[PDB]
Enzyme design. Structure first.
Site, PDB file in Angstrom:
ATOM      1  N   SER B 150       0.866  -1.172   0.000  1.00 15.01           N
ATOM      2  CA  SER B 150       0.000   0.000   0.000  1.00 15.01           C
ATOM      3  C   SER B 150       0.894   1.210   0.000  1.00 15.01           C
ATOM      4  O   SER B 150       1.888   1.238   0.726  1.00 15.01           O
ATOM      5  CB  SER B 150      -0.899   0.061   1.232  1.00 15.01           C
ATOM      6  OG  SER B 150      -1.440  -1.200   1.558  1.00 15.01           O
ATOM      7  N   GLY B 151       0.541   2.210  -0.796  1.00 18.92           N
ATOM      8  CA  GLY B 151       1.315   3.439  -0.884  1.00 18.92           C
ATOM      9  C   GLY B 151       2.560   3.343  -1.755  1.00 18.92           C
ATOM     10  O   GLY B 151       3.405   4.246  -1.717  1.00 18.92           O
ATOM     11  N   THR B 155      -1.968   3.544  -6.683  1.00 17.94           N
ATOM     12  CA  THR B 155      -3.068   4.473  -6.950  1.00 17.94           C
ATOM     13  C   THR B 155      -2.742   5.354  -8.154  1.00 17.94           C
ATOM     14  O   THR B 155      -3.538   5.463  -9.088  1.00 17.94           O
ATOM     15  CB  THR B 155      -3.290   5.342  -5.726  1.00 17.94           C
ATOM     16  OG1 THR B 155      -3.932   4.553  -4.718  1.00 17.94           O
ATOM     17  CG2 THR B 155      -4.287   6.497  -6.022  1.00 17.94           C
ATOM     18  N   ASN B 197       0.594   0.164   7.264  1.00 21.95           N
ATOM     19  CA  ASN B 197       0.063   1.091   6.272  1.00 21.95           C
ATOM     20  C   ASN B 197      -1.203   1.812   6.761  1.00 21.95           C
ATOM     21  O   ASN B 197      -2.191   1.185   7.154  1.00 21.95           O
ATOM     22  CB  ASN B 197      -0.241   0.336   4.980  1.00 21.95           C
ATOM     23  CG  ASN B 197       0.992  -0.387   4.404  1.00 21.95           C
ATOM     24  OD1 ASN B 197       1.012  -1.629   4.297  1.00 21.95           O
ATOM     25  ND2 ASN B 197       2.018   0.390   4.020  1.00 21.95           N
ATOM     26  N   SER B 200      -4.669   1.211   3.841  1.00 26.32           N
ATOM     27  CA  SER B 200      -4.590  -0.075   3.155  1.00 26.32           C
ATOM     28  C   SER B 200      -5.929  -0.567   2.600  1.00 26.32           C
ATOM     29  O   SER B 200      -6.908  -0.709   3.331  1.00 26.32           O
ATOM     30  CB  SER B 200      -4.057  -1.139   4.123  1.00 26.32           C
ATOM     31  OG  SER B 200      -3.921  -2.416   3.500  1.00 26.32           O
ATOM     32  N   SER B 201      -5.963  -0.849   1.310  1.00 27.97           N
ATOM     33  CA  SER B 201      -7.136  -1.460   0.683  1.00 27.97           C
ATOM     34  C   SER B 201      -7.317  -2.902   1.144  1.00 27.97           C
ATOM     35  O   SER B 201      -6.414  -3.699   1.040  1.00 27.97           O
ATOM     36  CB  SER B 201      -7.017  -1.425  -0.832  1.00 27.97           C
ATOM     37  OG  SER B 201      -8.219  -1.918  -1.391  1.00 27.97           O
ATOM     38  N   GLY B 451      -0.795  -7.764  -1.413  1.00 25.19           N
ATOM     39  CA  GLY B 451       0.226  -8.734  -1.738  1.00 25.19           C
ATOM     40  C   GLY B 451       0.644  -9.647  -0.599  1.00 25.19           C
ATOM     41  O   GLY B 451       0.188  -9.515   0.548  1.00 25.19           O
ATOM     42  N   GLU B 453       2.655 -11.246   2.335  1.00 24.75           N
ATOM     43  CA  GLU B 453       3.084 -10.572   3.552  1.00 24.75           C
ATOM     44  C   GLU B 453       3.376 -11.582   4.657  1.00 24.75           C
ATOM     45  O   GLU B 453       2.713 -12.615   4.749  1.00 24.75           O
ATOM     46  CB  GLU B 453       1.977  -9.633   4.042  1.00 24.75           C
ATOM     47  CG  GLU B 453       0.672 -10.349   4.434  1.00 24.75           C
ATOM     48  CD  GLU B 453      -0.371  -9.416   5.050  1.00 24.75           C
ATOM     49  OE1 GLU B 453      -1.151  -9.880   5.949  1.00 24.75           O
ATOM     50  OE2 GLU B 453      -0.406  -8.230   4.627  1.00 24.75           O
TER      51      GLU B 453
END
Ligand SMILES: [Ca+2]
Ligand SMILES: [Ca+2]
Ligand SMILES: [Ca+2]
Ligand SMILES: [Ca+2]
Lengths: 137, 787
Positions: B150-151, B155, B197, B200-201, B451, B453
């Site tokens: 994320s980040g 995006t 994060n 986070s989606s 992803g 992790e």
């Protein structure tokens, strides 16, 4: 349809068409080489000849497609492109004309050397029979 | 005695020399200290590119394609602000954390249209355009599968694809601007703070641009998958529920606060096991009333983020609702359901089977009002379920069966997850109504999903995510395998099987019927006394000698050592071994809503709630939904982008080596590099080889066109036909063989000069034949026009 030998030989011919080396001949490129060798096909004859063989339909000609797109009179007329004035013989000045029209870069020392290695009888020029013997090796 | 890469704790790799050898290790002397010699395992030492300042656009141009040379090549390119790099058709994209001038301009957009990948500098636009051209020509919908933390610039990456596709191949409808305007809404209901994060989606998002027969844009559609349901009810410390809950508590007017009976997040079970603090800065902290702030907020201060802010994001969320057509009624309808779910979670129970505690009376009242249920019906359906007196066909009677306390908790939470998930489905369908279309022939879609992790402690949540990614990684590998095989045929390299070690066995371990870990977990529920330990022993017993399963004792880390065989297992995933502690696996595998209670919510007084609604385990529901995602991807052509977060501080011009190495592993890039080692991982255009080596040749050969130059050189050198393959556009090399070719060009100039002299005949022939068969070709083209 074609022998292994002849497929390999046309692959080297294909790279002469495909100058940028991207593995594909555009319409623009196909014209450049025909016109450089003394021919005047038109924008519609090229495009329509391409579309009848463009199997994958990507507006462009790969090597497989080039093969299908392709009779000693063809061989003899092939010779006649090098033979500008047509004494039945290709000089160093005439080969230099077809080379540089084609895009090949060399000095006259180099041109003369090429003509010599193909010239079996030693008269300084290249006749039609000695022209075929190369093609086939 | 040439340079190698060897492990370094913060740069990932460092350059060094091998000075001693060991049984499974090598002794490395670093260049940059010279006598702080250290040990490294042999499979962690890699050969290095001689030229440390060289950079290539495609990593396949390297002489050694491995994780260390890839890392270094993208470091050098990042330092020159070239954030994009290929591995064949795969795009690596490192977030710059600053606005790069010109590379995203309308002129650049135009320059990428129609162009083959490989005729322009690496770019997200070349991936978008390849997807476009394959869709148009092959009449096949396309996927663009983006990995990354994320980040990590994902995006932004998605925005570049959508912008490219709409501006190039659309007709004035700004579809990509409508999706961006909807974003704050989607993120509110589907994103959350995790340990690592802030934003986070927690769902798989697949954004589709739809096209008509004419390959012109007609609309958009957001497909969504696998919303993480466990987060709705409980969170670990340092984590939150979905943003919506905190945006509503921090930002709602006092009027709405009283109407939904909200208060600080520490007052709600569904928020107060996690982090109860708001994202705020000095200014926005002053705009949140004191009665919204939790004890830990007042004590430790706010959470910090350069973008996220719960008060501000509340306003921005309400603004986004207006833009997608949502009136003030539908907006309050959304908030009412959200508060309904919060009060639902504060209902407790006591051994009478069981009863609502007396302290929980107002939670019931508030929940029931907000979800449009009669207080009494809700009380009963939480503490009891109906059941038929028979099971197998015979005529039966309805009976009332009382629930134990722990079963009441489960129905309460089950109802919460179902209401929230249905609300999420509603929100996404509402976004999709901002760019609808009656018909489409094909689509190009971009996938974003969490992803692979791992942490010190890995529970069922991690297991699911890592299972999802194991399957996506197999998909990635199948398609690269296929692209490579097709490239080799297209280039004339002949007969070449590439050695592929499949990860199907790891997948079977997890998901196979009856014997897979998920079905064994389901089987645990069926036993008289379900136990995490019995489930775990059954896994170890059934897969005693499975390549990808080990007991926790076998770990290469210290901290997993005292974990018993029945407290956990290790799975050897594509990206590395992960040790899972199995405590709570059984309860986390259950979230079924029994039928009287589900039927109750379906017939809520309130119409909005009825509209939301109009015996399978969590693991198998996960599998099922995952397989629908894969069904969709398998029906498309696939392209791959790997987004990389260069550091944890959102700072530009700061390449953090080990962090990036880690992401390259977890995103499956290293696994793909291994796969390509079975094929021809190194390749170079005749034009690149000509420019590298012409300085070593006589002027005669330096005047040839690049292809004939290379043919002459390769013939002259007498290269072994197994290791070196002369293609149509490039020379292809087996592992190490481009390096070996390079050494021949550098190690013995007198040998090379004699070999070149001796090829003079063959070259003069090939140069005649070339032009001869070319005039013959121009003749045959004239004759075909004459037909
Ligand atoms: Ca071309
Ligand atoms: Ca074609
Ligand atoms: Ca003549
Ligand atoms: Ca002669």
């Amino acid at each position: 349809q074609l022998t292994e030998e002849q497929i390999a030989e046309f692959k080297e011919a294909f790279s002469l068409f495909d100058k940028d080396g991207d593995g594909t001949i555009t319409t623009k490129e196909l014209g450049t080489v025909m016109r450089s060798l003394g021919q005047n096909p038109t924008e519609a004859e090229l495009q329509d000849m391409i579309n009848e063989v463009d199997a994958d339909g990507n507006g462009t000609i790969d090597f497989p497609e080039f093969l299908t797109m392709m009779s000693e009179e063809e061989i003899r007329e092939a010779f006649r492109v090098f033979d500008k004035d047509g004494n039945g013989f290709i000089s160093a000045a005439e080969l230099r004309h077809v080379m540089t029209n084609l895009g090949e870069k060399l000095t006259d020392e180099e041109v003369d050397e090429m003509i010599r290695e193909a010239d079996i009888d030693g008269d300084g020029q290249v006749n039609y029979e000695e022209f075929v013997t190369m093609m086939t090796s | 005695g040439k340079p190698v890469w060897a492990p370094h704790p913060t740069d990932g790799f460092q350059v060094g020399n091998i000075v001693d050898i060991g049984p499974d290790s090598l002794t490395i002397e670093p260049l940059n200290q010279k006598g702080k010699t250290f040990l490294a395992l042999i499979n962690q030492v890699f050969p290095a590119e001689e030229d440390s300042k060289k950079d290539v656009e495609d990593n396949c141009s390297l002489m050694y394609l491995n994780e260390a040379t890839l890392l270094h090549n993208i470091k050098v390119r990042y330092s020159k602000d070239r954030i994009y790099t290929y591995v064949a058709n795969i795009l690596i994209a490192v977030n710059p954390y600053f606005d790069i001038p010109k590379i995203y301009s309308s002129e650049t957009i135009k320059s990428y249209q129609g162009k083959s990948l490989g005729t322009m500098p690496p770019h997200v636009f070349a991936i978008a355009d390849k997807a476009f051209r394959d869709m148009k020509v092959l009449k096949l919908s396309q996927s663009i599968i983006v990995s990354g933390e994320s980040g990590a610039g994902k995006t932004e990456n998605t925005k570049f694809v959508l912008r490219y596709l709409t501006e190039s191949y659309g007709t004035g409808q700004d579809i990509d601007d409508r999706i961006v305007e909807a974003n704050p809404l989607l993120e509110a209901f589907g994103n959350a703070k995790t340990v690592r994060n802030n934003n986070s989606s927690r769902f798989g998002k697949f954004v589709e641009i739809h096209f008509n027969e004419k390959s012109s844009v007609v609309g958009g559609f957001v497909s969504h998958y696998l919303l993480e349901k466990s987060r709705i009810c409980v969170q670990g410390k340092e984590e939150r529920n979905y943003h919506i809950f905190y945006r509503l508590c921090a930002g709602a007017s006092e009027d709405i606060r009283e109407r939904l009976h909200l208060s600080s997040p520490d007052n709600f079970r569904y928020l107060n096991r996690g982090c109860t603090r708001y994202f705020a800065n000095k200014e926005t902290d002053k705009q949140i009333l004191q009665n919204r702030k939790s004890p830990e907020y007042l004590k430790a201060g706010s959470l910090k983020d350069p973008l996220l802010d719960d008060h501000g994001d509340f306003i921005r969320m309400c603004t986004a609702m207006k833009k997608i057509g949502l009136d003030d009624e539908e907006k309050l309808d959304l908030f009412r359901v959200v508060a309904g779910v919060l009060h639902l979670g504060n209902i407790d129970f006591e051994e009478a089977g069981c009863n609502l505690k007396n302290k929980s009376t107002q939670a019931l009242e508030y929940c029931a009002e907000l979800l449009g249920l009669d207080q009494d019906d809700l009380r009963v359906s939480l503490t009891t379920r109906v059941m038929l007196t028979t099971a197998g066909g015979a005529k039966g009677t309805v009976i009332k069966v009382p629930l134990k306390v722990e079963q009441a908790n489960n129905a309460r939470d089950a109802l919460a997850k179902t209401v929230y998930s249905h609300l999420f489905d509603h929100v996404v369908n509402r976004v999709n109504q901002c760019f609808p279309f009656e018909t489409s022939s094909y689509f190009i879609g971009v996938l974003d999903i969490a992803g692979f992790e791992y942490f010190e402690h890995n529970s069922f949540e991690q297991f699911c995510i890592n299972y999802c990614n194991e399957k996506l990684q197999q998909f990635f590998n199948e398609r690269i395998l296929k692209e490579e095989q097709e490239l080799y045929q297209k280039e004339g390299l002949g007969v070449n099987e590439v050695h592929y070690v499949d990860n199907q066995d790891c997948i079977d371990l997890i998901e196979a019927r009856l014997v897979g870990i998920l079905d064994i977990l389901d089987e645990e529920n069926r036993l008289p006394q379900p136990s995490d330990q019995h489930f775990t022993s059954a896994v170890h017993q059934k897969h005693k000698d499975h390549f990808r399963l080990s007991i926790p004792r076998k770990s290469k880390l210290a901290i997993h050592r005292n974990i018993r065989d029945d407290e956990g297992f290790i799975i050897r995933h594509f990206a590395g071994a992960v040790c899972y502690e199995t405590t709570q696996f059984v309860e986390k595998n259950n979230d079924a809503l029994h039928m009287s209670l589900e039927s109750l919510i379906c017939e809520s007084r309130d119409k909005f709630i009825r509209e939301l609604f109009e015996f399978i385990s969590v693991g198998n529901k996960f599998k099922t939904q995952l397989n629908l995602l894969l069904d969709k991807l398998r029906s498309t052509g696939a392209s791959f982008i790997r987004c990389i977060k260069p550091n944890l501080k959102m700072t530009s011009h700061h390449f953090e080596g080990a962090q990036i190495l880690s992401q390259l592993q977890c995103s499956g890039m290293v696994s793909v590099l291994d796969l390509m080692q079975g094929g021809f991982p190194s390749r170079a255009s005749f034009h690149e080889l000509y420019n590298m080596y012409k300085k070593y040749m006589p002027d005669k050969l330096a005047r040839l066109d690049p292809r004939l130059f290379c043919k002459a050189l390769f013939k002259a050198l007498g290269l072994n036909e197994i290791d070196y393959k002369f293609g149509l556009t490039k020379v292809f090399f087996r592992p190490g063989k481009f390096a070996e070719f390079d050494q021949i060009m550098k190690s013995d100039p007198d040998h090379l000069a004699e070999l070149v002299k001796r090829v003079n005949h063959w070259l003069i022939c090939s140069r005649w034949k070339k032009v001869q068969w070319c005039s013959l070709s121009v003749i045959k083209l004239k004759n075909k026009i004459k037909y």
